[model samples]
Every structure is written in structure tokens, then in C-alpha cells.
Target: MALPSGSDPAFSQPKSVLDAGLTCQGASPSSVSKPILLVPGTGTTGPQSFDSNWIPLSTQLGYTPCWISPPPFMLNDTQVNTEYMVNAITALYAGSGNNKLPVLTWSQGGLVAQWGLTFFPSIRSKVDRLMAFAPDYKGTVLAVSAPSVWQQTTGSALTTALRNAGGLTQIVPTTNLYSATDEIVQPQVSNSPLDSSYLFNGKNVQAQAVCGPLFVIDHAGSLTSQFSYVVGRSALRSTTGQARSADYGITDCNPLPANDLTPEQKVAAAALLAPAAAAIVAGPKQNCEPDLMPYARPFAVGKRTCSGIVTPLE
Candidate 1:
């Protein structure tokens, strides 16, 4: 269950990652430091499906919209897919007159963005800000049922390796956007260590929470919702207090205090919490450019083919 390489014609085609112009259509003045790149969730079919979620937001804000072209199933491996995504972003920035760009990734794409940062240092300066919508920072119970054997095998291995490697700090600074009742990734993974812990050194990372029930239909629905803006602004503010205030539905706006739950609750909470922190780690930084080659080489790649067992039942 290794990850896929962009070298493969099926995965590497220029059309796979980029479409004519920003997916969101009408362009803003491009006043934002960098245009926003939108990465969709797992099992995404293609750019059209991914764009469906981003177009509304981009159109409303006048922000440029872009997306990763990898197949929905290809995202199981964070390292591999992100490398592809980083390459696309690199190309986008090189072509555009802009230097720093902000990226918005939903669900599994969040992990891809985080991993991409570690490999592509050049992208760091080019990435101004990062936003993850309902990401699976830590391995999700739901992933257990992924259709891809690679997803099932690699997910377990990667999470174990990452934890042993150094906990959730492998990524940093990206803001995580999540919902309490998300039917997919657990809320704990999105909230806890993913938002709070640092990669390698254990510095406090920034994270923001969005309050809403899980959209329940699909990953695309989650990102396109109007509520996403509420969450997006909080992350843009870069203040947990502001994030807490921005949360619309959940009762706990302030992050739950450490040791707020029982052992089992802790596990669920960690699953729910860590991904947000992970998303933050994956976020883009102002004036930084990330390097994509190193990451593109080492990670494995494959297709989506798992069953429903990967996710928890509603």
C-alpha cells in the first residue's frame, strides 16, 4: 500500500492538477498575498467535484480558486499527494506574478499539504496562509474501511510511524477548520494535538474551530457551506480567542482544556483533535516557499479501493 508517484502519466498530466484559470471564475484583484489553492477530501473524482465546493467561496470573495488534480483515492498517502500538490502550487506561483500564496485544503488534503511543506521548503515562502476543512490530522477510525488496500495498510503504518517519529509536530502553522458533529473524521483529531502540539520541537501551533454538525453528505458539502467563511475568518485572524468567538454552533468555543475527558473519551477526542493541529502544521506561512522534489521522491503512491469499514458508523 505505498503511495503513487506523479511521474505516472495517469497522475502527472498537467490537467490533473490545474485547469485553465482559478476554478472560482471571477477573479479578485489578487490583492491577497497569494491566491488560495483548494485541495479536496479523499475519493474525490476530479477537479470538477473539488471545484464545486470551492467555486462558491472563491466567487463570493473574489479570491482566485485552484485545486489539486489527483484522483480522490490518491490522497490516502499524505506525503505523496502533497508533493504533487506542492509541485502544482510551485508552478502556479512561478507563472503568476505573485510570490506568496494561501492554500485551503479539505479533509485528507490537509494532511497532504502538511507533508508537502516538509518536503518543499521553497513553497514555504510562496505559501502565505493555509486552511484545512475537517482534516484527518491523526489517522481516523473511518480510514480503516478505505477501499484502497494502500490506504488501510499505509494509514496505520504512517500514523504509527509519525507518532513514533515524534507525535503531531511533523507539520506546523496551518489553521484547522472542523465541526463537532462531523460524521466522518472524529472531532478530537481535528481539535486536540493536531491544533495544539508542534512538530519536532513541541511549540504551540495555531488552530481555529468551526461549529456545525457534519454536513453528512460528502466532503465537498463540508467546504462549500456558508459556515466555512465564519471559520475561515477566524483562522485568518490567527487568534484562538477569535476562533472561539467565531464558532457558530458548538458550546465549547474555547478549546477544551487538557485532561477534559475520560480515557475512552480521550482516544475519541485525540482522533478528533489531532488532525486540526496537524492541519495547522500543514498550513502555509507568509513569505515562505516550499520545496517539492524531496517529498515527491521518497513517498509511495496508489489508488483508492477500500470499503466502508475505514469510517465509524453514524
Candidate 2:
């Protein structure tokens, strides 16, 4: 299913750590034919990265997993990141022996994946489904700090264009997985549907929607949690059910809360879990952003559907 090279549109050559985002993990004979592309949020990598959060379970499930690399600084240049993403998808599909691959992304990576699926018409045809672990599709207050980037995503010609250009759902089957207790980003940003605009009306499913807060999680933890990884894989199952989503029937497939560890905590844990060769990627150089606690609420399932679309699960 790989497109002919000449017919392929070349934007910019992918030439950054961003290019290394996707890495094949623990693939074996029992692995599924369909490959799963894991896009890391901000700055992260394979086993050493937050995408590693799911690799442990993905290894057991037999889905050949590939992770996306962030820019060297992890502070991405939006245009370059988009181009890098387009290249990654092209390569991932090609490497999959042309099978339709499913995509999984978290945080800004969701916007990057959507930008690719939304603008690059051909790539979407190569994709099967998308599940954003914790996306801020509706835009975030952080846009105030990064207006140039967030505004383009929250309510921009690109977003409206995404909605109008075949509508988002037309690109492929899609689902959103997020923790209402997410601390980094707000509910309106992460918990809304892909096409919701900067409003509370877009259709989406929440963690608690399945069982309750006990299953809900936090921001980075949503990506790094073993249970989050477990349930996420269920949603990616090519077969059927909540993993497949009929009414997204409460993706309550119980996953462990190992992700309760914060970013720094994940980093510390990576020392034990990551291979020696796995290098650390630095966070953005933004000012005033202190290193946040790993478990802000620690054992608490902060809230649900923080999107303000409905009553938050208390």
C-alpha cells in the first residue's frame, strides 16, 4: 500500500529527533498485522519516553508498536513538527507492508496527527483509526502563552477546515481517551471531541464514563499509566467492543494505575525500566514552569469530564 515515491508530496525533509518518534517495540510472530503508531506528547521517546507507558502492555498484546520522536528541544516548531509527522506516517504505513495502521497520540501530538490527517488528504486513506490519549483539541488557555500555536489549533482556519474538509470522522474511525483529572491542560482542551471547536458540545467519551473515577487518571499519567496503556490497547483492537466502541461502552477494561507517577517520577522510573542507550530528552525552555509533582493528587481521582460540557464526575 506504499504510494509511489514520485507521486508522494514532499513538504520538508524530516530531519530532527522528531524523526525518531516512532520505534518498533517487542514485536513478535503473534503480533497483529496492523501496526500501531504511538505519537508522544511534547518531548518524549520510546521505552525511555512516555510512549513507553503503553509499550509494556503493547508488547503483550502483540500489536507491533512504533513511537514518534519529538524535536531535539521537545519545544516543537509547529510547521516543522507537522512536516515531520507527515513523513512519519508515510514511513510507518510503508514499513507496515502497506497495511492500514492505527494512530495513537497524546497532548499536542494529537493536534499534530490531526493536522496531518486533516490537511494531507492522501495520508488519511492509509490510516485505520485514531485514539488521542489526552488531547487538547478545543484549544487550551496555554494558547495565551503560546498564542501563535494554540490559536491555530483551538479556533483557526485549520480547525474549521478540518471540520469542513470531509469532516474529521470521515478521515477514519476515531476516539478520544482522557483523564478529567488532568492537571496540565483543562477539560475543554483535552476532553472534547476532535471536531468540537473551542466549545463544550463535541461528542467524546471520558474515563469515568465506563466505570468511575477509580479508573480515571491525570495528565501525563494518562499516557504513562499501565492501565491507561491496557485500556488504550483495547480501544485499538481491530476486532470489536469498547476497544472498538459501540457507544464506546465504557472502556472499563481495568488497567493498573502505575501512571500515577508524575513526569519527574516517570523519569526516575525510566532509570530502572529504560535501557542504558535510551537517552533523556529535555523539556521546553519555557519560563516560570517549575517541575511539577508526579502525583499532584497522588491517590485521588481528581474529577471527571472536566470539559464543562456536562457535570464533572465528582
Candidate 3:
């Protein structure tokens, strides 16, 4: 079944809102440069998540970088978060003179990239590739009863509905960098949906595979881990928008200067974690998972419909 149009007026945002959400450096797009959109994890804004590493690294890679700052934090519903992502993608495409976008996301934001591309198929053609860190596409086992956590719980209705609707299919080439030792999401392989299948245009890269088997990284650490930087940079640098395992052999888990964060970056990374830590500790608790949006539910029960247009579950 075809996904909803990303440009649907039902999901449209005002110019002021779109401009406020998208923060881009002044770097102009060149013939080869594609704008990179950075999506932040739950409890962190885009700048808070990427300013320490990704934002700067994008500039060094010669690509124009833009961070989508979802207001407050991304603790909202996945469907609502996806709307912001769609807005950012649309603005970035036009902002870059119609260049296909490269979306880089961490944790919950990874769902934004995945769901945005899946539910909004029009944006798939506009997206060059996707680099996701700890996506938890199949949902996590270590979920609490928060809204986001409920949806992220393993075998939740949202995840099941998404999978049934062809949400896991790779409409755009995607790279998933995840850690086996993630504290928040259990069964880390949940991030690796299309890795085993040869037909899928997706790659699941464990930090251990690129670094070392013993290299341990937590959920938050995966966002800034040098392992992610190495593989992610290689993918963006590649002409075909895919990261090769060969690039791992060159570094070979050796300590590089990129691993050492500057004092300022260290401070920035800490600032990034401060609010998230607080949010987690003080976050409201719930007993039940939130109901899936009308459009996200399977037709057999809730009758999934998109602004009066209903598509049968594939």
C-alpha cells in the first residue's frame, strides 16, 4: 500500500514554525553536497544532541547541516514526532535547492526518520539516505510506562501495526548503528531489521563489530561514540550513500584523535545529558501504553484512515 503524502495539507505547518524548528549553517549546497538533517533523541533538543559532534562533523564532511529542534523534547507521541520530521525534510529539501536529504537520528529520533519515511512516502524520494543510531525499530524490552516507552515496548501495537503496514521495508537506503550493551533498550538487535536480508537496502552495524567485541556502549553513549562517527562519516562520504565494512579495518578500533573530545565539546555533551537525565528521573509514570493514532491502527480493528483516505493493511 502507498504511504500518506508527506506534503499533505493536513500535516502542513506555518512558515514561522518550520523556520523556527530548522537550524542550518550558512553553508550553501554545491553540486555534490546534500543537506543533512539531524534528529535528536527523546528528552533532548537537536542542538543539545548534535552540537558536540554531528553538527561540527557534518561541516567537516563538506555537507550543509541542519538540525531539527523539536520543541521542548521529543517525549510526544511517535506519530506527532513524525510530523515534525516531515516538516523538517520538506523545508530542508527546498532550503537546499531541491537536493535529496540525508537524515541522521539517535534513539527515539531514529523512529522519526523511519516512520517519517515510511508513513510519508513522498519524502522517501527526497531523502538521500538515513543514518540511525539505536533505532529500536522493533521496540525495546526495557520500557517503562511513559508514553514513548509504552510505544517502544517490545511487541507493542504501534510496532506491530507499523510492521504490518510495510513500515520495515527500506524505501530509502538506511544505515543503523546500534550497541549490544544498550541499557535502555534490550535485545539490541531490534535495531537491525533488514541486516540479514540481502534484498533490503539497510545495514545494521553493531558498535562491537566495528570497535571490539568488548567495547561496551550505553544507549546515550551510542549517539556520540567514536565508532558511530567513523562508520557514519564513511557512509556520508561514500558516493552511493552506504558505509562499507572495509572502512572499519582501516581504523581497526585504534584510538584516534576524534575519540578525544575537546574541552568545549565535553562541556556541550554534558549539557546535552543534563536535562535528559532530569527528564528521565522526573518523568511522569503511566500504567498502560497509549492507543495508536487512528491512522496508525490496523484496519481490522480500529480502521486505519489517513484524512478520510483509507489504505488497506498490506
lDDT scores in order: 0.45, 0.50, 0.68
**How do the residues 101-122 of candidate 1 rate in per-residue lDDT, one tens digit apiece?**
6677766666666655544556
Error of 2 at 299 (Å): 43
Q: Give the alpha carbon lDDT tens digit for every residue of 186-252 in model 3.
A: 6764234432111145777777766666777677667776667788887776676877777765354
Collision count for each candidate, in order: 68, 13, 0
Give the range where candidate 3 is weakest over 10 consecutive residues by summed lDDT.
190-199
| Model 3 Cα shift for residue 59 (angstroms) | 1.4
Candidate 3 ranges with C-alpha deviation above 4 Å: 1-9, 12-15, 27-33, 143-145, 189-200, 250-257, 270-274, 283-286, 299-314
Lowest-sum lDDT 10-residue window in model 2 = 291-300
Candidate 3 or 1, higher lDDT: 3
Predicted structure with the largest TM-score when compared to the true one: 3
* TM, every model: 0.56, 0.63, 0.82
Candidates 1 and 2 compared: the better one by lDDT is: 2
Worst 10 residues of 1 by lDDT: 304-313
Q: Candidate 1's C-alpha lDDT? A: 0.45
Candidate order, TM-score descending:
3, 2, 1
Backbone clash tally (model 3)? 0
Local error of candidate 2 at 57, Å? 2.0
- Model 1, residue 268: distance off in Å is 30
